[PDB]
C-alpha cells in the first residue's frame, strides 16, 4: 500500500526486512571476524588516491569504507561510539551484534515472536552485570609496579603487530603515563602525549622520550642547537603584524619621511623585543652554558630573527594549540600572552635541549626535566603506512592502560569472561523470569551467542574451536567440586586452555561493559524492525 503514496517508494515488510538484518550483519561480521585476535588478518585500505593503510582495527576500516547497506550502518556507528570512550572494542561489538541476530533468527522461524526475544536479552544482560562485579579482581595501583603494566599493555599490542615490534612498543606504551598521576583529583588525560609522524631509523628502533618534542627547527643558523640550560618563555603574541584592524595608511610630504615612517613601524617591534632581552640578562650576565629559548604559537618576524641571533636565543613559531598547555606541564613554566609582565619565576627549566636535522626539516627535542608533568612518544616508521599502523596501535594502547588507573578492577581476557557467562545463563531458576517459556527463549539465544568470541579466536589460528572449548567445559566441572577458583583461558599456540592471569592477558572494564550493553541495543532494535522503508524527494 506504499506505492499508492509515492510511485518511487519501496519497502520490505515482516520477514522481507528480517532477512536483511540477519544477512547484512552476518556479511559485515564475516569480513571483520578475521581481524579478532593476535593471529588475525591484516587489511590493506586502498582508496582512489593510492593511499595505503594497514590496520586490524575496525574503526579505521569502517570509516574509510562507506557502507551501502543501511543495516550495517547501525553496527558501524555503534562500533565508532565504542572506540570513542573506550578506545577499544570495535571488532568485538561487530562480532556480537551479528551473532545475537543469527541465534535469535533461528527461534523466529520456530514461531517465536521477537518481542519476548528482546526480553531475554535485557534480563540476561542485567545478570551478566552482577556476575561482572564478582568476576572482576581489584588491584592496588599505589605501588606503581612495572610488571603489572607491561603485561596489560602487551595484550593490546599483540592484536596489532607481531611479537618483535610488540616487545619494543610495550615499555613505550607503559611509559606513556609515568609521571602523570593524581591521587586525590582522579583526573587522567591522555591528550598530553604527542604523536609525532616522521620517517627515521626503523619502526622497531623507536624510543620513548621523557620530555616534549617539537617539529619546528631553528630559523637562524647562529641559533645554538644544543643548550644546556634554557628558560622557556611562552609568547602567544605575534611579533610580526599580519594586518591592522582599523584601515590606515602613511602619507608623507617629503622623501625624508619615507625612512622615518618605515622606522615608525620599527618602534612597536622593538618595544616587544626590549623587555625580552632584559629578561635574559636579568638572572645573570655573562653566564656561559645558560641559554634562552622562546616558543611562539603565532608567526615570528624573519626580520627579528637577527635580534635573537646576536644573543644566541632559539625561537620557534607556528606552534600547535594543544602545545601551550603542555609547556606548563613539561617545562614547568607558565603561559604568557604579552611581554608587559615578565619574571624569572614564570620561566621554565630544561636540562637538555637539542635539535636534529631529518631530511629537509629540523625537529626540536626537549628533555631532562626535574618533575615533568607530561611526556611524548616519538613514532618512527619506514614508510607511509608505518606511521598510521603504529599510531593506531598506540592510541588503542593508551585507553587500555588508562582504565587500569581509572578503575582498579581488572577483568581477565582470552575469552575467559565470555565462557563464564555461558554456564551462568543456562538456568536462571526462579530468580528473574517474568513469564513462563517466553523469557527463557531469549536467554538461551543470548547465552549461546556469547561463545562466538572464543570460537572466533581459534578460527583465526587455524584450529578447531569445538575441540578447544570442549576441554574448557571439562575443567570448569572439576573446579567447582575441588573448592578451587580457576580462570580458564584460550591459548592459540598449542590449541589448549590456559590461565589469563598467568599468561598475562587481561581486558578493560569499560570495553567489556559497553560491548555487552552496546551490542544488545543494536541487535534488539533490528529484531524489532519489521519494515525497511525508503522515501524522500530527489
Amino acid at each position: 500500500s506504499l506505492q499508492l503514496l509515492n510511485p518511487k517508494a519501496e519497502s520490505l515488510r515482516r520477514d522481507a526486512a528480517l532477512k536483511v538484518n540477519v544477512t547484512s550483519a552476518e556479511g559485515l561480521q564475516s569480513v571483520l571476524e578475521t581481524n579478532l585476535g593476535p593471529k588475525g588478518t591484516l587489511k590493506m585500505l586502498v582508496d582512489g588516491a593510492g593511499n595505503i593503510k594497514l590496520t586490524k582495527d575496525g574503526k579505521v576500516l569502517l570509516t574509510e569504507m562507506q557502507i551501502q547497506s543501511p543495516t550495517a550502518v547501525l553496527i558501524a556507528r555503534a562500533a565508532a561510539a565504542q572506540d570513542e570512550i573506550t578506545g577499544d572494542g570495535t571488532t568485538t561489538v561487530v562480532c556480537l551484534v551479528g551473532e545475537l541476530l543469527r541465534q535469535a533468527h533461528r527461534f523466529i522461524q520456530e514461531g517465536v515472536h521477537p518481542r519476548i526475544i528482546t526480553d531475554g536479552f535485557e534480563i540476561a544482560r542485567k545478570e551478566s552485570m552482577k556476575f561482572l562485579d564478582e568476576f572482576k579482581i581489584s588491584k592496588t595501583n599505589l605501588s606503581n609496579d612495572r610488571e603489572f603494566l607491561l603485561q596489560v599493555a602487551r595484550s593490546s599490542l599483540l592484536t596489532k603487530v607481531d611479537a618483535d615490534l610488540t616487545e619494543v612498543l610495550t615499555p613505550i606504551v607503559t611509559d606513556a603515563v609515568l609521571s602523570v598521576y593524581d591521587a586525590q583529583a582522579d583526573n587522567l588525560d591522555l591528550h598530553m602525549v604527542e604523536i609525532m609522524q616522521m620517517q627515521h631509523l626503523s619502526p622497531k628502533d623507536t624510543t620513548f622520550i621523557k620530555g616534549l618534542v617539537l617539529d619546528h627547527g631553528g630559523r637562524h643558523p647562529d641559533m645554538p642547537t644544543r643548550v644546556k640550560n634554557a628558560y622557556v618563555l611562552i609568547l602567544n603574541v605575534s611579533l610580526e603584524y599580519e594586518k591592522t584592524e582599523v584601515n590606515s595608511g602613511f602619507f608623507y610630504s617629503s622623501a625624508d619621511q619615507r625612512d622615518k615612517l618605515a622606522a615608525s613601524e620599527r618602534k612597536f617591534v622593538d618595544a616587544k623585543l626590549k623587555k625580552i632581552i632584559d629578561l635574559k640578562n636579568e638572572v645573570c650576565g655573562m653566564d656561559p652554558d645558560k641559554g634562552f629559548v622562546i616558543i611562539n604559537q603565532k608567526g615570528i618576524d624573519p626580520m627579528s630573527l637577527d635580534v635573537f641571533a646576536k644573543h644566541n636565543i632559539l625561537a620557534l613559531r607556528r606552534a600547535k594549540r594543544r602545545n601551550m598547555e603542555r609547556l606548563q606541564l613539561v617545562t614547568g613554566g607558565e603561559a604568557q600572552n604579552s611581554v608587559e609582565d615578565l619574571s624569572p619565576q614564570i620561566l621554565g627549566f630544561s636540562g637538555l635541549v637539542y635539535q636534529e636535522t631529518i631530511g629537509e626539516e629540523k625537529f626540536t627535542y626537549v628533555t631532562e626535566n626535574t618533575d615533568p608533568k607530561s611526556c611524548t612518544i616519538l613514532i618512527k616508521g619506514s614508510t607511509h603506512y608505518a606511521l598510521a599502523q603504529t599510531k593506531d596501535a598506540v592510541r588503542d594502547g593508551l585507553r587500555a592502560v588508562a582504565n587500569v588507573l581509572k578503575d582498579k578492577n581488572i577483568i581477565p581476557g582470552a575469552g575467559a569472561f565470555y565462557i563464564a557467562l555461558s554456564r551462568y545463563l543456562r538456568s536462571a531458576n526462579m530468580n528473574k523470569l517474568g513469564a513462563k517459556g517466553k523469557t527463557k527463549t531469549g536467554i538461551e539465544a543470548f547465552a549461546e551467542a556469547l561463545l562466538v568470541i572464543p570460537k572466533t579466536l581459534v578460527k583465526n589460528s587455524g584450529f578447531d574451536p569445538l575441540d578447544v572449548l570442549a576441554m574448557v567445559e571439562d575443567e570448569l566441572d572439576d573446579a567447582q567440586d575441588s573448592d578451587e577458583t580457576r580462570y580458564v583461558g584460550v591459548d592459540l599456540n598449542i590449541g589448549d586452555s590456559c590461565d589469563p592471569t598467568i599468561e598475562g592477558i587481561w581486558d578493560s572494564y569499560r570495553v567489556l561493559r559497553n560491548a555487552i550493553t552496546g551490542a544488545t541495543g543494536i541487535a534488539s532494535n533490528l529484531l524489532l524492525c519489521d519494515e525497511l522503508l525508503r522515501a524522500g524527494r530527489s
Partner: protein, 541 residues
C-alpha cells in the same frame, strides 16, 4: 540456472571495492605480478645495467638506472608495488646509495617464498624466519671488513668509496667523474691538523650545474658557484681589486617603505620641487656608506629599482639578483658573510672575501663565475658538466648526488668502513645463513635456507648483464671459497671472465658497510609486508 545468485554480500560495501584475500588469490600470484617490474630493475643493475626511458604525462623524459627515480615517475595501480616503491624512496632520502639493491633483494625474498607457501608453510612462521635470519646477517658483517680506515681526508682514500659507486652508473667514465667529486669534497672540508667531533657535512656543499655541449673530459671543479644571470652596470675589474668585500642583502635596495600601501601627499608646490631631488639624496645616503667600506659587490634577493642601480654603477659595485632564496645562502658560504636584511652600513666582521669574479660563456650562454682561489671557503663547491644531450647528463647528476651521499653516510656515523664488492659479500652470506639453519632445529629451517637463496641474484646479475652463463661461472665461484684469499673471490665482467676469478683488491671495488645494513633491513621489511597482508581492499578508480 542462467543467472548467478550475485551473492548476498554484493549489496554490502560497494561495487567499486575489490577484494583479494587468502585462498581468494594473491598467495604467490601477486608475487608473480611484481616480476615484470622486478625484471626491469634486474636489467639496470651493475655497471652493465640498462637505463630505462620513462615519459611522464607532463612530457619530461628521465633516463636513469636508479630504481628509486624510475619508480617515482611511474604511476602504478598495483598497491603492493608501492610497498616496494616506498621502500626504495627511504634508501634515496636517508643513505642515498643502494636503491637498486633494496628492490632486487626484496623481490627475490618473495620469489623464494613461492616454494615455502606451496609446501603448506603458513605466513606466520615465515615472518619469524626472516626476522631471525636478518639479525644473524647484521652480526656477521663486522668480521668481514678489511677496509677499516681512520683517514677520511686524503683524496686517494676516496678511491675505494666514491669511485666504486661511480663505476656502476655511467661506467664509460671512471677517473673523469671520480676526480670531479673527490676534488669537490677536498674543497668543502676545512683544512686542519686533526678534525674530530664528527665535523658537519651535508649534500648541499657539492652542487651540479649542467651546461650543454662539450666533452665530459673538459669538465673541471670550481670552488665557487656558477649561476646563469645577466650582469649590469659595468665589466668586472678582474684581479685589479684583488680580494673585494661582498655584502649580501636580503631586502632589496630602495628607500624603505611601510608594509601598508602608501602614496605621496603634497599640500603645496614648494614640496614638489624638492620631491625630485628628495628621493635622489635619500637613497644616496645609504649607498654612500657602502662604497666607503670597500664593498665591490651587493646581492639583493628581490628586485632592485633603477634609482638604486644608478649610484652603484659609477662606484663599480656589482649587483646580482639571485631570485631563488635557496641559492642565496650558498653564495654566502663562499665568501663567509652574514646575510643582512637591513641596509645601514656594512660592518667589517659581517663582510666576506672573494678573490675574483668573471663572466664567461661555457656553453654559449653568459654565466657568472664565483670561483675563489687562495680564499677560505666552507662547505661550498660545484661541478660543471659538459655533455651533448640533456638526458644523459640527468643520470650523471644523480650519480654525483649518489657519490656525495656516500660521503654524508661515511662522515655522520662513526664510519662506513668497506666491504668486498663484485659479488664477494653476497656469496659469503650464503654460507653463513645456510650453516645457521642447521644449528637450531625446527620448522624455521625452511625459511632460513630459502633466505640464503635470494642472495644469488646479485652476483649473477653482473654475469647475466655481461653475457655469461650463470650455470658455469657462478657454480665455479663457490668452489673458489673452499679453504685471507678466499674472501676476495668475486664476479668478473670481461672477455677474460672465462676463468671467473679476478682479485678485487686489484681494481679496489668496495661497498659501504653501513649501506648494506640499511638496505637489508628495508628489503626484509618490504617483503615481510607483502606476506603479512592477508586481505586486500581496493576502491573504485
Amino acid at each position: 540456472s542462467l543467472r548467478l545468485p550475485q551473492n548476498p554480500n554484493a549489496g554490502l560495501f560497494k561495487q567499486g571495492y575489490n577484494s583479494y584475500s587468502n585462498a581468494d588469490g594473491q598467495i604467490i600470484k601477486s608475487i608473480a605480478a611484481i616480476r615484470e617490474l622486478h625484471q626491469m630493475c634486474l636489467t639496470s643493475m651493475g655497471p652493465c645495467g640498462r637505463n630505462k626511458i620513462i615519459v611522464n604525462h607532463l612530457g619530461k623524459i628521465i633516463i636513469t638506472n636508479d630504481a628509486a627515480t624510475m619508480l617515482r615517475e611511474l604511476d602504478i595501480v598495483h598497491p603492493a608495488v608501492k610497498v616496494l616503491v616506498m621502500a626504495t624512496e627511504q634508501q634515496k632520502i636517508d643513505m642515498g646509495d643502494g636503491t637498486n639493491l633494496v628492490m632486487i633483494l626484496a623481490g627475490e625474498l618473495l620469489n623464494v617464498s613461492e616454494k615455502l607457501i606451496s609446501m603448506g608453510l603458513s605466513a606466520v612462521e615465515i615472518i619469524q624466519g626472516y626476522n631471525m635470519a636478518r639479525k644473524f646477517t647484521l652480526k656477521e658483517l663486522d668480521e668481514m671488513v678489511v677496509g677499516e680506515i681512520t683517514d677520511k681526508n686524503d683524496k686517494n682514500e676516496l678511491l675505494k668509496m666514491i669511485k666504486p659507486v661511480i663505476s656502476s652508473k655511467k661506467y664509460g667514465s671512471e677517473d673523469i667523474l671520480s676526480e670531479l667529486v673527490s676534488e669537490a669534497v677536498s674543497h668543502v672540508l676545512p683544512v686542519a691538523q686533526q678534525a674530530g667531533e664528527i665535523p658537519y657535512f651535508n649534500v648541499d656543499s657539492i652542487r651540479v650545474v649542467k651546461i650543454m655541449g662539450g666533452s665530459l673530459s673538459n669538465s673541471t671543479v670550481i670552488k665557487g658557484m656558477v649561476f646563469n644571470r645577466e650582469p649590469e652596470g659595468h665589466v668586472k675589474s678582474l684581479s685589479e681589486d684583488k680580494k673585494h668585500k661582498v655584502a649580501v642583502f636580503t631586502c632589496p635596495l630602495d628607500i624603505a617603505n611601510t608594509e601598508t600601501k602608501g602614496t605621496v601627499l603634497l599640500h603645496n608646490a614648494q614640496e614638489m620641487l624638492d620631491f625630485s631631488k628628495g628621493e635622489e639624496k635619500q637613497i644616496d645616503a645609504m649607498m654612500k656608506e657602502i662604497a666607503d667600506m670597500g664593498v665591490e659587490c651587493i646581492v639583493a634577493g628581490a628586485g632592485v629599482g633603477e634609482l638604486a642601480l644608478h649610484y652603484l654603477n659609477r662606484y663599480g659595485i656589482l649587483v646580482l639578483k639571485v631570485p631563488s632564496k635557496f641559492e642565496l645562502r650558498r653564495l654566502c658560504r663562499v665568501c663567509g658573510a652574514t646575510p643582512l636584511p637591513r641596509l645601514g652600513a656594512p660592518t667589517p666582521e659581517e663582510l666576506g672575501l672573494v678573490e675574483t669574479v668573471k663572466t664567461m660563456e661555457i656553453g654559449g650562454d653568459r654565466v657568472t663565475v664565483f670561483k675563489q682561489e687562495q680564499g677560505e671557503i666552507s662547505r661550498t663547491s660545484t661541478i660543471i658538466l659538459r655533455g651533448a644531450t640533456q638526458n644523459n647528463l640527468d643520470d650523471i647528476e644523480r650519480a654525483i648526488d649518489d657519490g656525495v651521499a656516500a660521503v654524508k653516510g661515511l662522515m655522520k656515523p662513526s664510519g662506513g668502513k668497506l666491504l668486498p664488492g663484485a659479488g664477494a659479500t653476497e656469496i659469503e652470506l650464503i654460507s653463513r645463513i645456510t650453516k645457521y639453519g642447521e644449528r637450531t632445529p625446527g620448522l624455521l629451517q625452511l625459511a632460513i635456507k630459502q633466505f640464503a637463496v635470494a642472495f644469488e641474484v646479485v652476483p649473477r646479475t653482473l654475469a647475466e648483464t655481461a653475457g655469461l652463463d650463470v650455470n658455469e661461472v657462478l657454480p665455479n665461484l663457490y668452489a673458489a671459497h673452499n679453504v685471507t684469499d678466499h674472501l676476495y673471490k668475486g664476479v668478473d665482467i670481461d672477455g677474460e671472465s672465462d676463468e671467473g676469478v679476478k682479485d678485487i683488491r686489484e681494481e679496489n671495488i668496495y661497498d659501504m658497510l653501513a649501506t648494506k645494513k640499511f638496505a637489508i633491513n628495508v628489503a626484509t621489511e618490504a617483503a615481510t609486508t607483502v606476506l603479512s597482508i592477508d586481505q586486500i581492499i581496493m576502491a573504485k578508480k
